[PDB]
Ligand binder design. Structure first.
Ligand SMILES: CCCCCCCCCCCCC/C=C/[C@H](O)[C@H](N)CO
Ligand SMILES: CCCCCCCCCCCCC/C=C/[C@H](O)[C@H](N)CO
Ligand SMILES: CCCCCCCCCCCCC/C=C/[C@H](O)[C@H](N)CO
Lengths: 238, 252, 275, 58, 60, 275, 58, 60, 275, 58
């Protein structure tokens, strides 16, 4: 017949093969196709939906619904820290099991901006202000409100519109970070401070609750497939 | 302003004055079944006034220690008029819905509900190798209740708020068509929900299409002189309901 | 060739426009770009959402089960093996499929067969090359009950024959469901009186595989272990849902023990101290 | 019966050849070059859409 | 010769194969074809004929 | 691309037209559509009678016989084997062919050969690879009577040689009948005086196969068992007939013991009771 | 000497390539795409055909 | 299938091969390319630069 | 088709032009042609700088490491092996890459696997063909800790399976860096306070390979030794630098002992004597 | 989808054929026929260039 020569890689099985193979059931009439609402063409469509962040994961608050509640109240002087975490969507314990953290934990590189949305769930007669700061690394963690307003921040006034958006800008050396932890691609710190206190009238509760949301912007990407570090089985599922 | 909304379906009308918006499914508005996606061969039944109208379920009481509630929804309307009768006499049903939830307070009360509408909420069991009775997955117009901790009742759903009965993170449960009832801005939450299934028509007793879930993230809280009793009322209206395969009444 | 969105330049602003103020109570995710809050430059961005599509995310070969059978035994049931086909006994492919509720895909099936000489007194043999047979039975067909049974003839059932040392066997399989999608979750019963079994176990109904050695009784036992690899291709997927927090228990139900939402921190505010 | 299409290359700096060999469409290779999306049914899933500068719940 | 690479599924026998194979008798003159009444092109032609139903299959 | 018939819509009727009233005494099957009796809607139906055609129904490989022979024996007849070619010793392919009276098809023949080391005292050998020979003899040719016989030369007879471990041997065979179709049933005699043999055994006359090992006498016995797979392709079929109720007995005749028409019910009317 | 024809796909949502390699027509693959039929010789096998609305044995 | 014949040199590994092989990571998005000064296209560009000669290599 | 420069003819000269007088203090290499100093003829030169380009100089397969593992042991860690991927443990490919500071290339990886029967009392066996598995783990993935560990499933990780006696396994690998080039040298620290590790060890981060036998515990030990061959193709290279005089010591740093600049002569002027 | 280009032959005394078979550009063969160069950035890397006959530091 035709003279041919075998190259290396012959008769192997690669998991990421893209070849053609014969059908075990020839001329099989496949059932017709139906329009079903909610078709997904990209996991990045899923990752752009807001979802609630468990910021209060502190020592057995995870076995309840109290892990989602950020406690806030009237203060004595001013200018204290409300909460704080590190911008690691997939390595930080705060946004680990969040939807962006799940999809990013099926990947190894990520890139693009991140929206943080904060909903005030207190009463209609209560007022307050906050400073929602982002600080790129190189220094450490800002230790007061004076060091926190030297970076990217926003003052949020609580009124009729009940939610604010801190859109974390993509500021990086490279084009991609790593999803797991390394010293080279460190991203910064999300922190929140009292601009003014929570002033409330009489016969109204003082202590209220902030909820937090996260999603990705329209310039977001993920690059390298891997297995998620969350799957741990020992035997089969008989 | 756009906070006032009026909805008319049949001889029933809801007027709200502190609405937020209306979420419509995955963008799709509920319509009838076309001839290209059809499977059955006989003429369907389209009542369109005696069926497509608002039905009001039971009100539930929301204390400071309330955890959540759920309703299965082709089955909570089993005994609701000619919708339930048309369920009892036909074999194949197909409809969309409009889910409106009422909860009111004053400007001195605080709290925040999450109203989710989850397709195919196949729930877990309290004891793992045990069979769940049907009275615990659904109870009709009477709500079932989540618990704060690990529940271990017999023949019952695993009732924990932080897993939503399905084994997932409850914070990630906003991928579904949802709204919030925040008591400082909102009064109600309207969700238009189309027909979602793997088959064009289905039986409305053997299958559970979706599950409404109302879970309070921010707990209810008030002062020592305010009103204590705060109800939560769910109202549902089928949309574009049609029926196929008429035979005698029953389910067995 | 579909790029991500460019970053457009902006300047100072002072007006009644409020992109950062919104209402998340309407179920709406805000479309806020970083050029709406801070001053940005012009960035021509060339990134492509390529390796995140539903085709590239699922189309990877995954081990679904291990099948073990021998070549000579005292009992005839250990000389052949069978497997009711599901994708829900290995947690990786199960958790990758359970992002969605309904799926529609063709399957690409690859078998990897290895044989090990069992421990015996007469290990010094000269065994000719083993030949294996993998018969697929569509739901309802007759079942072989021995290795020498006459139901192994494969007059109508699909089959594949492999000699030891070649490439792994591979065949393609179309979309085989009686409905319009493989239903990953079925919230419902099997009987119309709402009794029976609860879950997706009513809608499996895919058939089952059978495994034996085409060779006869050898004079020394050899244990074959064949691994089945599914590859979902030509993928469509609908109505997404959150990933599972909890560890699985069984294949037939969805039941669990409750798990905490995430890992604890033991504090709530960061600092430049030991964090 | 050959089809020519571009390869996946990087930016700032091709044309493979494919012929189908089997009678069935279930034998074809994976369609790994469909990069389109539409998050308008998951984000922005509302009636009476919002204009991002208005108070929107004004 | 021409460099090639073997895929999985090589050297197997599938019952539903649709390949080409050489003839054991080359240039064999096949006998002519005759029009015979009652040609079947589909078993669904057969299944559309009425046939009697044994409804009274009761105990011998 | 041939679809099934669409279902057309209908309304109420009151007239002297009677589609449901007919007469089955004329040998006529009524053409009644469901839109003739009840009110139907419009259904655009996309089903295709594709996997029910006579080509797709018969063109599947089926085991027709098992052939056994050895490599060293005391008697020379057990070192080779022969088989008179028919399709009527396995009931599945026989019952699939006997839907029709006459057929016309090309054949695709595939052999699957496996060897097993027989039990002996000197099993510790090192055997080089066995080579098998399959010779086809057209009707009338000379017959080999030993493994070392000189009629195994294959100067004119078709043959195939296979080394152990390769793909199965496959060759194509044209339509070989002296008439215009393979007669599945022959109602008639062999002699003109209406004696002799009665049945299709006069019209078989297809030749016969022969099997041996090309290797010589080995120093240990090995039993080869080769399985013949026919595949009918290029199929034409005429004058259908009912399937066989009764179990077969022999290959040469059509004889049987009488079998009941179907399974008994023990009652005649259904109910909502234990049925 | 190539021939291009459509593949068996489903409805509501191809073009394989075949070249024959042997000198005989008995070597060709199976003709698995002939989907035509005519049940007019098994159903309706009568003289003086029936019009399905008439009493037909009137 | 297609009749072919293997030549000598089949199934060998030559260090100076120039063939094609499948990717272990299909559709991998390679990072963009940047203009960096001092691009080398030939070692003969390097060899044409003057460099100092150790002529006095005499005993330590 | 790019030739070298032709040699042009010249004659006598007497003028104020000075091609031979220059100044090397400006960092400038003089462009003096031999037709500027002496009388030359016309030479039409057909030499091509072809086998000196950066593509032809680096695109050769080079052994980077040897990996050893066994098939039965008392300790489970000697039945499998692992290798953190670098190009800096063999001096030939390292010194060929370190002509430049930054590089950008696709990789072509070839494995050469050989097995040797270890010394034991029961060497008289009959071992079926060994099958090897090479799993690549991108940085961050889970690590197998035994040969029977369930992390060898390769649902998402790239893998390759090789049966003994075939061609060597070969796959292509694209440019995998998070920056714009593989940085051969990194002058800097890992921590922002200028502590930690100093050198290119921060920028390796390429993943690591894993090696085992797919077969189970055999009844005699066999030592496999697999050799990894990298081939840099599609090559771009920037900012050259002098070759290394000194012998290497380690893979992680660049440290050395001082070496003399060249070989000694013991005299400084040549002669027709014993030189 | 074939590409024809000349072979490496000697002077004073061809046309191979290449078809790419894989969907990725990292599978292609080595580009061993780019023979261009520019030593103007390593030799002559100066401002106010020199004219080779002038004293140049005159
Ligand atoms: C021997 C040749 C044929 C080989 C048969 C192997 C597998 C046959 C079944 C096709 C595979 C379908 C597997 C299940 C698909 C879906 O994921 C599940 N139904 C749940 O979604
Ligand atoms: C060794 C190479 C040649 C292999 C010969 C094998 C078989 C030769 C005979 C052709 C097969 C015809 C089998 C019988 C066909 C019809 O079904 C029967 N006559 C009854 O219908
Ligand atoms: C099992 C299939 C995949 C095989 C994986 C083998 C190697 C994977 C890594 C790619 C090779 C990159 C090697 C290093 C390249 C550069 O020279 C270094 N970063 C330093 O310049």
């Amino acid at each position: 017949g035709l003279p041919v020569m075998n190259t290396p890689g012959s008769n192997q099985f690669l998991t990421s093969d893209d070849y053609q193979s014969p059908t075990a059931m020839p001329q099989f009439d496949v059932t017709p196709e139906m329009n079903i609402p909610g078709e997904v063409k990209n996991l990045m469509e899923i990752a752009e939906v807001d979802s609630v962040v468990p910021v209060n994961n502190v020592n057995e608050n995870v076995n309840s619904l109290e892990a989602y509640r950020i406690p806030v109240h009237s203060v004595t002087e001013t200018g204290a820290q409300v909460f704080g975490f590190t911008l690691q969507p997939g390595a930080d314990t705060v946004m680990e099991r969040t939807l962006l953290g799940e999809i990013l934990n099926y990947y190894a590189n990520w890139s693009g901006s991140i929206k943080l949305t904060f909903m005030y769930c207190g009463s209609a007669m209560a007022t307050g202000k906050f400073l929602l700061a982002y600080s790129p690394p190189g220094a450490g963690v800002p230790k007061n409100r004076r060091e926190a307003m030297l970076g990217t921040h926003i003052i949020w006034d609580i009124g009729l519109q009940s939610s604010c958006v801190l859109c974390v800008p993509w500021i990086s050396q490279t084009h991609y970070r790593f999803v797991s932890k390394d010293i080279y691609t460190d991203a910064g710190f999300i922190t929140c401070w009292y601009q003014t206190s929570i002033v409330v009238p009489a016969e109204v509760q003082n202590q209220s609750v902030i909820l937090c949301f996260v999603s990705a912007c329209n310039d977001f990407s993920v690059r390298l497939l891997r297995d998620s570090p969350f799957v741990r089985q020992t035997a089969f599922y008989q | 302003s756009d906070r006032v909304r009026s909805i008319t379906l049949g001889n029933s009308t809801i007027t709200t004055q502190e609405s937020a918006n209306v979420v419509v499914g995955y963008g799709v508005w509920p319509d009838y079944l076309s001839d290209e996606e059809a499977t059955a061969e006989d003429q369907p039944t389209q009542p369109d006034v005696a069926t497509c109208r608002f039905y009001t379920l039971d009100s539930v009481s929301w204390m400071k220690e309330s955890q959540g509630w759920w309703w299965k929804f082709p089955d909570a309307l089993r005994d609701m008029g000619l919708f339930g009768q048309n369920m009892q006499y036909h074999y194949l049903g197909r409809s969309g819905y409009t889910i409106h939830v009422q909860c009111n307070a004053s400007k001195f009360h605080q709290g925040c509900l999450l109203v989710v509408c989850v397709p195919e909420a196949e729930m877990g069991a309290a004891n793992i190798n045990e069979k769940i009775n049907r009275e615990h997955l659904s109870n009709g117009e009477v709500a079932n209740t989540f618990s704060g901790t690990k529940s271990s009742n017999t023949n019952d759903v695993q009732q924990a708020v932080f897993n939503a009965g399905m084994g997932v993170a409850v914070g990630n449960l906003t991928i579904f068509p949802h709204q919030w009832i925040n008591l400082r801005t909102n009064n109600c939450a309207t969700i238009v929900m189309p027909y979602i299934n793997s088959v064009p028509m289905d039986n409305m007793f053997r299958h559970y299409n979706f599950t409404l879930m109302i879970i309070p993230f921010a707990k209810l809280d008030y002062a020592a002189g305010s009103s204590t009793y705060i109800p939560i009322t769910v109202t549902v209206a089928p949309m574009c309901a049609e029926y196929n395969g008429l035979r005698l009444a029953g389910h067995q | 060739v579909v790029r991500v969105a460019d970053t457009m330049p902006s300047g100072p602003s002072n007006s009644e426009s409020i992109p950062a103020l919104t209402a998340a109570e309407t179920g709406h995710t805000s479309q806020v770009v970083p050029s709406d809050t801070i001053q940005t430059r012009h960035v021509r961005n060339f990134h492509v959402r390529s390796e995140s599509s539903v085709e590239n995310f699922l189309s990877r070969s995954a081990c679904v089960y291990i099948v073990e059978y021998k070549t000579r035994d005292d009992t005839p049931d250990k000389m052949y093996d069978s497997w009711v086909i599901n994708t829900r006994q290995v947690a990786q492919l199960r958790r990758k499929l359970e992002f969605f509720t309904y799926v529609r895909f063709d399957v690409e099936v690859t078998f990897v067969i290895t044989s090990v000489q069992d421990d015996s007194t007469r290990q010094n043999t000269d065994t000719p090359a083993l030949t294996h047979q993998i018969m697929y039975v569509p739901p309802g067909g007759p079942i072989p009950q021995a290795v020498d049974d006459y139901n192994w003839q494969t007059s109508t059932n699909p089959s594949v024959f492999w000699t030891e040392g070649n490439a792994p066997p591979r065949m393609s399989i179309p979309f085989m469901s009686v409905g319009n999608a493989y239903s990953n979750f079925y919230d419902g019963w099997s009987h119309f009186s709402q009794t029976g079994v609860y879950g997706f176990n009513t809608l499996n109904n895919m058939g089952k595989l059978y495994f034996r050695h085409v060779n006869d009784k050898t004079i020394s036992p050899i244990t074959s272990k064949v691994r089945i690899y599914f590859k979902p291709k030509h993928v469509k997927a609908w109505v997404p849902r959150p990933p599972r927090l909890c560890e699985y228990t069984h294949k037939d139900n969805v039941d669990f023990e409750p798990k905490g939402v995430t890992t604890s921190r033991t504090q709530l505010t960061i600092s430049n101290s030991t964090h | 019966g050959a089809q020519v299409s571009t390869q996946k290359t990087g930016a700032h700096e091709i044309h493979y050849t494919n012929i189908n060999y089997y009678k069935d469409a279930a034998s074809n290779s994976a369609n790994r070059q469909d990069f389109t999306q539409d998050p308008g049914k998951f984000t922005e899933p509302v009636k009476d859409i919002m204009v991002k500068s208005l108070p929107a719940l004004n």
